[PDB]
Amino acid sequence: FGDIQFGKYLRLSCDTDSETLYELLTQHWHLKTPNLVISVTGGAK
């Protein structure tokens, strides 16, 4: 847990589910979505 400075980050297991993550990020953090965009890169050093 904690914020980043030079921005909230989290070290998260792959064992966790997706529904209580959604409850965490909508109920504690900001609001919902009418849309959601996915962009896939990362190997491009």
Number of residues written out for the chain? 45
Enter the DSSP assignment of 23: H
Resolution in A: 3.0
Tell whether the torsion through CA atoms of 8, 11, 14 and 20 is positive or negative: negative
Cβ atoms < 10 Å from Cβ of 4: 7
39-44 long-range Cβ contacts below 8 angstroms, 24+ apart? none
Long-range Cβ pairs for the range 7-12 (8 Å, 24+) = none
